[PDB]
Write a protein that binds this ligand. Structure first.
Ligand SMILES: O=C([O-])C(=O)[O-]
Ligand SMILES: O=C([O-])C(=O)[O-]
Ligand SMILES: [Zn+2]
Ligand SMILES: [Zn+2]
Lengths: 339, 311, 340, 317
């Protein structure tokens, strides 16, 4: 493995953002304080907090949040002493006004996430986040849908706008290690060498730890993961497992392995309702390249309309639906119930 | 006995997608309007070439070059298909000449009007703003439901094909969700409002989709809502032929034991109304998948015509 | 993307009814065997492995007694399949040539003779006897993480010498990442006769079961061990239905019915799971500390019994460098820790 | 009790490798009743023969034929065979023809299995005695100690031996270890059903041999009496194996209805599982600490010869 064991891996947790999807956005303020504290004391560089679909994800479409982002980010910002509080913003869902609210509640990292062909809608957010003095990251959602060279040019756009780090985002958990490597190659080809890269894997093919380590091997600087993988679909790269695997490779992750193992089992896993695991329905997200936040809504539809969520998800993949199109989960369910 | 040519001469400002589609649409469908002139900023613009082909005086010297045109002395309405910062400039110049202004930017100098909802309230408005694609397709449904029972919360999801997404929307995508929420309140009648927009590059390009979520008290008459909504659909296809329900109107009892954190209200119970729209473009100059742009030209056109027939 | 030959047939060996015995304390009924073997067989798998968790005559105080004997289990599977080969597993020191004869009479045609990855030389009699029966004879080198690529290949060569037609890299601890897997197949391919096949038996303890099986294929592997849901020791084997679904996205010639494997996983097998076959603190320990995966539920039983952390028992077991078949040492470690 | 009084039985050691040589050294260091009259080997270069001629023991590199011609053979009354099973068949034929008793440390199993603390007396006159396996010598004492207090329906032993120290013959015939040991667990240990398992572990810092003994007995067995039988057995083995000890207290586990175990021989069963965890360290004087598997063989063979010698006259007919 040509990974530089000395290079520090930026560890970016998403238990309290992506994990919102696993708990229908119903984290309490005490959940957020307790989990941000454990992750803070375990050495992670950033804790990400927002509704799963990002700033102002709370909605009929994605689910209403149990508290606002403001209350959530304030709880996290107050609980952590060394980690930065990150947040997620999807243009078309959240706005720069929402960002300004998040920065004022304590977030100092923002990831502006567009679909991977639509980076040019993110300029005003990337610029405004730079103006605030934030660490400004671009997120290219659903990266499996885009060629490496195509994905890299979109990364270049967000870089032109002032983003200091672009993430390869496998929103559908659909990519394997070779897909991942090809895409980091393409990015390091065109990005300024100083611009950092990150990896946001989903575990839908059980490749969340594997893809993150391979991203590292092709130059990646930042790794998104979550405790028990708490996240959309089969979850994110499981943070305690990736850290345990990085330890055995001797990598400079700077985390307390046992602390993460213990926080994952003792704090987070007991909060799970629908089990964050690879199974028929979450496998379908990866097999068919469907946005992972669809999983619980698709199972909602599967029950309410008496159909197979698996088939519902395969049909959503067949219509090339992307992130934020939860309303088409019902469209597709309604169509299947007709015929 | 047939018609008499009482047509109002109108000016179209902007030479791109919108202005050209509004041009073709008026010449093929209006008994009441004549395109008197088209206004660009570039003498190379094909839109300007088209207008000249179809016998329409042009200028490439902007609204300034328009007022100097011999056709301007009969112009009674002008459409603005440029930008909001340009409309702030244009409005004054045309107002001072008596020209009614139909603004297709989000400059929002004049009031928001969704024609089928609150035109009559703004018949005399000298400057009229057409809000957004999503507003023109969702507020009708919001107001349809709010007729039966007051809508505590309205939320719209605009799904638009990336090819048709206009450069204005791309450069200020927050303004889309902001303009539309504002008008969901004012014109739509909702206590709280929310607007979301999604660009999808799927090939073949997707037809526009608009999902409208309404939250009303558990009392609300389900059958009456269905009637108000379906009747409102037809009122809208009078100027947007492609505007059709994709799914029968849906209703979900939000029972105790499944309280939702509706914003503005607290944790609440009641009824959830979901209506699934689809807006195919008319095909006149813009493609069928550009329903976002076609609903704007259609709605601006019908506002101009209602002015014309008002007297 | 990769350098795998998308046209090369992947031999698919299911271990649901053998390594998966460990998930169910070897209490699979004859009816589980028949239903699961038939489902696996009708989905296109090449082999279905049937034996006690620890191989022929695994049944013991040491590993747990089995609800039925190897003979009855193997017979039940042999009878219920129409195309797949019935495989079985044999650990010298536990199972014997006489137990191999019995399993052959009962319908097994593949046998994997498993030794620690430094003790290939105890397998001659078993590998030689199996060749004389005309069985597909395979050599298993367990705890392959405890050996160096080159040493492992030297043990593999010994087993080839005795008559093995195939040799498997065995991540019994679920402790190896993709690079470890690759280095070992390269070393294997340097020394093995070109006709000797090669196979992967990953465990999922670091969630690399599927990734390690794919990277093995990029490096020349012919056979992949997996099981439905991962049903198996520790966090499980490579999850069969996941692996096939990833291979299918890659256009690999696996010859399996994705949806049938996916539905048998959910509908037949997972329901039979008692302790969840997943990556959590206790199964993670197996891969983190390099500990034989069958230890998992016995460790957790000692942990409950003497009021200890199962994690600590497993870590200490790694520190002492216990290997396969040493379940008696789990109690030994627990008794020592309770003296505190 | 004069200075020159020599009443020791002269024994011959056949095999000059590890077993034979450790046995030679152990007899000279410890036995008061035996003397090493000859070491019989097959190769003039063996370090065992070098050591023997150094300690002044007569040697031959010409097998048992070489022994039969030695002046030392006249007084050899007991032969140890630590060579091969096939060779012992031939060796025994020659030795019996000269009326010499044979203690066989190979798997030839011509004569009865003997575990000295269990069934030596029953075989005091046996012209050929087999020493079973290292595992059997280690664990059958425990099986017998339990069986004395309560019938052992099922006994199972797990031998864990360092890779370095495992005998070439055990490596070549690992099945035979489990079979011979479980056979002798029945005949000599007294269990109704027998199981032996062997594991070879290559740990650096070579491992001291471990043996775990499992006995399944009825629910009403006397727990205190079993503990005392086992602890007393351990004291008896320690007379000839000093490094033989309990690593853990005797353990007991109730198997109660609702958690029946499919114990072979019985079917599903309730009762009591006895677990005895032994550690067996070798004397470490010629063979190292971790070679307990070899050291217990020579310890056991020495003590059988010693008890033969303590019966009475040696007559070679
Ligand atoms: O933004 C995310 O978390 C994603 O799209 O996977
Ligand atoms: O046999 C096995 O499954 C092992 O050793 O992993
Ligand atoms: Zn995500
Ligand atoms: Zn295994």
């Amino acid at each position: 493995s040509m990974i530089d064991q000395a290079k520090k891996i930026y560890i970016s947790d998403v238990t309290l953002r992506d994990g919102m999807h696993a708990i229908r956005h119903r984290y309490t303020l005490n959940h957020v304080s307790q989990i941000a504290r454990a992750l803070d004391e375990a050495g992670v560089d950033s804790i990400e907090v927002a509704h799963g679909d990002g700033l102002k994800g709370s909605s009929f479409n994605y689910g209403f949040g149990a508290y606002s982002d403001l209350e959530w980010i304030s709880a996290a910002a107050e609980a952590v002493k060394q980690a930065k509080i990150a947040t997620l913003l999807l243009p078309g869902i959240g706005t720069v006004h929402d960002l300004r609210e998040a920065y004022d509640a304590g977030a100092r990292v923002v990831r502006v996430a567009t679909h991977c062909t639509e980076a040019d809608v993110s300029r005003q957010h990337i610029e405004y986040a730079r103006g605030l003095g934030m660490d400004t990251v671009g997120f290219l959602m659903m990266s499996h849908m885009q060629t490496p060279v195509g994905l890299a040019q979109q990364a270049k756009l967000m870089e032109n706008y002032g983003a200091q780090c672009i993430y390869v985002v496998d929103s559908g958990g659909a990519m394997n290690m070779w897909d991942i490597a090809e895409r980091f190659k393409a990015l390091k080809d065109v990005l300024d060498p100083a611009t950092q890269t990150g990896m946001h894997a989903h575990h839908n093919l059980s490749l969340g730890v594997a893809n993150s380590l391979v991203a590292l091997e092709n130059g990646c600087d930042r790794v998104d993961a979550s405790l028990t993988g708490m996240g959309a679909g089969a979850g994110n790269a499981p943070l305690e497992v990736f850290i345990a695997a990085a330890e055995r490779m001797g990598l400079n992750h700077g985390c307390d392995v046992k602390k993460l193992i213990n926080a994952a089992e003792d704090i987070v896993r007991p909060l799970q309702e629908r089990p964050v695991r690879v199974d028929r329905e979450t496998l379908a997200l990866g097999y068919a390249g469907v946005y992972s936040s669809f999983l619980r809504h698709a199972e909602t539809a599967a029950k309410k309309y008496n159909l197979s969520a698996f088939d519902i998800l395969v049909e959503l993949g067949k219509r090339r639906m992307i992130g934020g199109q939860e309303d088409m989960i019902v469209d597709v369910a309604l169509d299947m119930a007709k015929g | 006995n047939w018609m008499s040519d009482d047509r109002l001469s109108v000016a179209i400002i902007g030479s791109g997608n919108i202005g050209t589609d509004l041009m073709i649409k008026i010449m093929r469908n209006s008994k009441l309007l004549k395109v008197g002139a088209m206004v660009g900023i570039d003498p190379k613009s094909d839109g300007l070439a088209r207008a000249q082909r179809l016998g329409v005086p042009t200028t490439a010297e902007g609204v300034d070059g328009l007022l100097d045109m011999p056709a301007f002395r009969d112009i009674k309405i002008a459409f603005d298909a440029t930008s909001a910062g340009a409309q702030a400039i244009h409005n004054q110049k045309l107002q001072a000449h008596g020209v009614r202004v139909i603004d297709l930017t989000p400059a929002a100098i004049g009031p928001y009007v969704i024609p089928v909802v609150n035109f009559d309230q703004h018949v005399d408005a000298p400057n009229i703003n057409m809000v957004t694609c999503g507003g023109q397709a969702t507020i009708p449904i919001v107001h349809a439901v709010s007729k039966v029972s007051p809508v505590h919360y309205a939320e719209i999801v605009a799904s638009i094909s990336s090819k048709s997404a206009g450069p204005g929307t791309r450069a200020n995508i927050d303004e889309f969700t902001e303009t539309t929420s504002k008008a969901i309140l004012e014109v739509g009648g909702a206590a709280q409002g929310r607007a979301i927009i999604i660009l999808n590059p799927a090939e073949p390009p997707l037809i526009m989709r608009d999902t409208v979520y309404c939250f009303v008290s558990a009392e609300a008459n389900i059958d009456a809502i269905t009637d108000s909504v379906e009747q409102m659909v037809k009122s809208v296809q009078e100027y947007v032929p492609g505007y059709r329900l994709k799914q029968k109107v849906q209703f979900e009892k939000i029972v105790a034991g499944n309280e939702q954190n509706i914003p503005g209200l607290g944790w609440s119970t009641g009824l959830k109304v979901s209506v699934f729209l689809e807006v195919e473009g008319a095909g006149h100059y813009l493609p069928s998948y550009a329903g976002n742009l076609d609903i704007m030209t259609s709605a601006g056109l019908t506002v101009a015509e209602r002015i014309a027939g008002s007297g």
